[PDB]
Symmetry: C5
């Protein structure tokens, strides 16, 4: 048997995707996320919505999906389908349409149990867009990523990179459109409405000025 097949069997034959992948239920599943703005397709002042094509990546730890490499031909990482493992329900609020995003089949996994998921997002979000300064307008729209259902005691959200490095990330931006990206400011806040439930969310402010 080839090493990859042996490892895949050893991992997925005694694993089920329903449960949150933690040995002890008393510990939360920390998720680190990152956002890169690839393009700004449309900014609609009439409908107060804008479309952003952003490259989204996140990683978390599956305490069940870990192995010792020397028993599997020193395999340090491998790829398996995303639908064969637990995936956090980290969803962006303020959304109005996300169906344009294709579902990526595979996710990378490392022998420590770390899972890396890279996916694109074609999300259109609803936010306030004023046209007061039309000729030299500057807009401030926000993306907030949250564990839709799980509370902070189950899922917590953190940054993959340092805040300043992602705040000034124009490395892959399509810098030839009507809008110019000034920054992507992150922000962490604990959101709570009921008297006992706290949810963790991460707000990304996309700052853009017309040209």
């Amino acid at each position: 048997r080839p090493a990859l097949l042996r490892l895949s069997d050893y991992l997925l034959t005694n694993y089920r995707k329903g449960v949150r992948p933690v040995r002890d239920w008393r510990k939360p599943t920390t998720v680190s996320i990152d956002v890169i703005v690839y393009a700004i397709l449309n900014v609609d002042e009439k409908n107060q919505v804008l479309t952003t094509y952003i490259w989204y990546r996140q990683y978390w730890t599956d305490e069940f999906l870990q192995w010792n490499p020397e028993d599997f031909d020193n395999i340090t990482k491998l790829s398996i389908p995303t639908d064969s493992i637990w995936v956090p329900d980290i969803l962006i609020n303020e959304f109005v349409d996300v169906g344009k995003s294709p579902n990526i089949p595979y996710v990378y996994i490392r022998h420590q149990g770390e899972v890396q998921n890279y996916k694109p997002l074609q999300v259109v979000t609803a936010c306030s867009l004023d046209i007061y300064n039309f000729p030299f307008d500057v807009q401030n729209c926000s993306l907030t990523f949250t564990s839709w259902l799980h509370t902070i005691q189950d899922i917590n959200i953190s940054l993959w990179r340092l805040p300043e490095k992602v705040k000034s990330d124009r490395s892959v931006f399509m810098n030839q459109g009507e809008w110019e990206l000034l920054g992507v400011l992150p922000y962490f806040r604990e959101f709570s409405m009921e008297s006992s439930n706290y949810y963790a969310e991460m707000k990304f402010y996309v700052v853009i000025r017309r040209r």
Copy 2:
């Protein structure tokens, strides 16, 4: 075996999603629902439809999905996929398009058997919108949630919160659009057309005035 995996097996290995989860078929499955209006994307007088982005949550009791925590490391609640359990067919009438709503994967479950389902709704509804008072227009559109198929003797609908607390809920409203939300008035009515079938539905009147 970790506690979460043991509990998930104990629950789902002797459970099937087809049946209504009640020990005695003679008792109805009471469902408590709540509605929060997150935004009002569009109000179309031409087509007599308006779009509402509302946060919808509901809970019910699965008499099969219950356990004693002290046998499972004092696990009081856990999350499992929504497609692995019975889910009421509580659907909003007056709808014209609901495909924009993403399907949430997970639902919370408590050791009493209570199931909590949080999901977003991007529903567009058809209702009468008059433009008689255009400059200072005030509209009155309704959302009615009902068990589409099940009668009252199988599924009944109630309120999660007290009516007055939800009638004046503007806690998460996007209060920067063309429309302002004055209230969300609930109302319970038994709907019957045939001589023997009674269905339970809950009408939510979204009252909005232009600005």
Copy 3:
């Protein structure tokens, strides 16, 4: 074991959805249908199409899905997923878009073997719409429901209610739009093009006049 679970097992453990549910293949599967027009969202003279939101219900007999109640705690009816049983391919011709219709999960079943399926239809149909009498225009569009593949010797279509009761059914119509519903006239005809195949279809004429 609770009665519902016992009945569900007894029914679905020795049943498969591929075959037409009849003890003798020589007899057709009679399907009784009913149509209620809930609203008329749009009437497009330019594209010669109109949209109708109609509440559709049908019932048929599954000779396999029958039981004696006294052996199952006097259970006279129960609900199971629609995708777990055979469902007739009764489709409306003249259609141009039906994707807006959500798939209802459950269907009611009675101990006689009768299956009841309630579903909504957001169908848009192509029909001739003349604008000759625009100010006082009256239109006559038709919906024809047929077993798309099965011939009359396999599937036959009948009316749930008497023709006159459904011809004057405005009980749930949204009577506040641009169009007023005058009647829904049914009609049964045997449709045949090849020299040996006869198909049963039921035409519903929706008569509407502008206002």
Copy 4:
């Protein structure tokens, strides 16, 4: 056991849908197709596309799905789900959108092994539409059906009916639109680009003149 269930088991318990249904791999799977134009919803000169609602039927021989009727209560034909058998990938080129077409569940099968599949097509195709003779314009758009992947040595395409009978088929046309159908001319051609691969396709020219 009823005859239908016995036959369905006998057929599908020793059958798998992946392979091409032929006893000898050296022989091609001949597919006979037919096209009937039910309506011409739209002809867009701006985008150079037109929409045709056509009734499509095809049949082929499954050498595995055959039986002797006298062993199954003289059952000469039966219906089973289309997703439970092999189906040719006969796809129409020149297409721009086909998602509007619903997937038909069932297909008829005869004891000889013949499979009959009736399905509707809401395809919109891209073809050259000149507006030179606008007031009395006559257009000539084509539909070409081909085995997308399989070569002629695996799948071949033929006509169900004689060419002249289908060339003058206006039997179910919606003859009340802006366009009138003059004929549907078939044509068979072997398409080859690589030095060794030949693919069989059937071109249907829909001839229409404005009115």
Copy 5:
């Protein structure tokens, strides 16, 4: 047992689609791709997007899906469903909508282990389109195909045909639209943002001038 069924069983009974199909994990899975532009449906300067209907084909080697023909009636190639085998996540960046593309069921396979996948692409891409030379405008938009997740050490991308033959391929172009295709220039580049990850992508520049 017929040869095709024997081969399909021998192949797929000891094979799983999760893993990358290589005997040794230390070697990358080289993928050869080709692009043919069938039509240019729309070029939108307003939204800075253009739609291209391109015929896409690719092939790779599955080291598990190989056999010796003389043991299977000299079967040199056969077709099996695409969802039953591993398929590279080679996705086109710069995309804005790909849902229009239908999923092809089957893929060809040869006894060496080579897998051939032919599929159509209805992708709309976002690229800079200037209207400076409107009457005689010439545009330069790019398609870049990459292994979305897998690095170069896992998936590498190459050309099926020689660059010059594909650079001057107008063999199936719909040469009757508003735009004329001057060439499809390929280009290979190793894309890297993190300090250790290198991804292989292939850029195809579609050069078009108005007429």
